[PDB]
Every structure is written in structure tokens, then in C-alpha cells.
């Protein structure tokens, strides 16, 4: 479960 970065 990846946490979101600015691009998401």
C-alpha cells in the first residue's frame, strides 16, 4: 500500500 506523492 504505497503512500501518495505530489504526482498522484
Amino acid at each position, epitope marked *: 500500500l*504505497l*503512500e*501518495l*506523492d*505530489k*504526482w*498522484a
Partner: antibody
Framework: DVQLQESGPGLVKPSQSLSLTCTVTGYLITTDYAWNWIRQFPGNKLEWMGYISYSGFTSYNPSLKSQISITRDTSKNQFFLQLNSVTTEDTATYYC?????????WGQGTLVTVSA | DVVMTQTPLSLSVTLGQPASISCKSSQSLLDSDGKTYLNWLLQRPGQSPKRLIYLVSKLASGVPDRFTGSGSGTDFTLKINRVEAEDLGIYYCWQGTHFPWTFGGGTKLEIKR
């Protein structure tokens, strides 16, 4: 688990088009995340090429814009890389990867030699 | 495009000693959202690259606390507290703050014997 598997021709002639497939297992590419392509030249240099998101939007490295296209087939859970009119400088190891959106998990990589 | 530079090119460390790698960017990696998207990558011989560090200091799932990332702005550091043999290979820093995303040229960790 989530595994990415690259596949495609290991040898392409200059001026021809390069075509690679990344087969995703253990997760639907339509669910979430960005699905990336990255290559490593001889000498270890890494270069981000672009991605196609789960929603189908694409983003490309400006250096490659007029050469590159990333597409997908949601029925086979695959996404694709295409470079038209390659040159010998496109010789590299090509990796598929995914992140949210920054790449976090990498495939096994596949070598593509561009030569006559 | 944002240039990532690493030093040294090769680092020879005795087993058990700490190792530190340096990474520098041609411009600040602090984003307007407050976060700094600086990442570390490890490539062991014959293998694909693996994620080691994201957001400067956050460890990817599976990475030992032996690995410590730090820094800000345009200066970053990767520290390996108690170097083990399997740690050998090539370490890359790369940025995701600016578009396009770009990688450092890498630093080879070799075990001194």
C-alpha cells in the same frame, strides 16, 4: 504479491521501432498507481522514460517526447513501451516499474541491443 | 534538467565500519507541498535496482535500520552503520521533486579485505 515481467526482442535494427511488454501479476493496472519505464545504459546510467497511470494518462520525459509512446491492454493486464526510429544509442537494459507515482518496485529488466 | 551528482565514485569500506555516500542536486529538492522527494536505490551485482530510501529518511519495507538517509535542500547523505558483505554493489540517489525525474550516476560500495 506484485511482480513485473519485461519481454520483447533483444535485437532491433537502427531506424526500426522498439517494442517492449511488461506483464503485471498480482495487481490490476487499472486499480491505482503509475506504471513506469526506465532504462540503464552501458556504464550504469539510469534514465526515467515515462509512465501510464491507472487512469490511462501518460507522462513522458521531454527528451523522448517525439519518439516514445506508452500504452496498455487492460484485458491482458499489460502495459507497453514503443520507441520509433531507434539508434544504437538506445542500446540499454529496459526496466518496467510502478509507484504512486514515483517508482517503488522494479521488474527484472530486459536487454535491448540496437545494431546492424 | 535537475542534475544529481554523487561522491565518491567508489567507496572501499572494511566490514563492520560505517559508510557514507554524498549526493548533491543542481537545485533545491524541497517541494512547494513541504516534502522533499529524494530517493536512494541499491543495485547488487547481476540484479535489478531496489528501493532503499524515499522522502530523504523513510525506509522502504524490508530495509534494515542500518541504513540512514538525511539532508535537505541540495545536500543529502546515505549512511550504512555496520556494513555487511551483501551491501556491496551500486547505490544511486535520485529526485522526484522536479520533472523529469532524474538519477545520480551511482557510487560503488566495495568491501575492503
Amino acid at each position: 504479491d506484485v511482480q513485473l515481467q519485461e519481454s520483447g526482442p533483444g535485437l532491433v535494427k537502427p531506424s526500426q521501432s522498439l517494442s517492449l511488454t511488461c506483464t503485471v501479476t498480482g495487481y490490476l493496472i487499472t486499480t491505482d498507481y503509475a506504471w513506469n519505464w526506465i532504462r540503464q545504459f552501458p556504464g550504469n546510467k539510469l534514465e526515467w522514460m515515462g509512465y501510464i497511470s491507472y487512469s490511462g494518462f501518460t507522462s513522458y520525459n521531454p527528451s523522448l517526447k517525439s519518439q516514445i509512446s506508452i500504452t496498455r491492454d487492460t484485458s491482458k493486464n499489460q502495459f507497453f513501451l514503443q520507441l520509433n526510429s531507434v539508434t544504437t544509442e538506445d542500446t540499454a537494459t529496459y526496466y518496467c516499474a510502478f509507484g504512486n507515482y514515483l517508482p517503488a518496485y522494479w521488474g527484472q529488466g530486459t536487454l535491448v541491443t540496437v545494431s546492424a | 534538467d535537475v542534475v544529481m551528482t554523487q561522491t565518491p565514485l567508489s567507496l572501499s569500506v572494511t566490514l563492520g565500519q560505517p559508510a557514507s555516500i554524498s549526493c548533491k542536486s543542481s537545485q533545491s529538492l524541497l517541494d512547494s507541498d513541504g516534502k522533499t522527494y529524494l530517493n536512494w536505490l541499491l543495485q547488487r551485482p547481476g540484479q535489478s535496482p531496489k528501493r532503499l530510501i524515499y522522502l530523504v529518511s523513510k525506509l522502504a519495507s524490508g530495509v534494515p535500520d542500518r541504513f540512514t538517509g538525511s539532508g535537505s535542500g541540495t545536500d543529502f547523505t546515505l549512511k550504512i552503520n555496520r556494513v555487511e558483505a551483501e551491501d556491496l554493489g551500486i547505490y544511486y540517489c535520485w529526485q522526484g521533486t522536479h520533472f523529469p525525474w532524474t538519477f545520480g550516476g551511482g557510487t560503488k560500495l566495495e568491501i575492503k579485505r
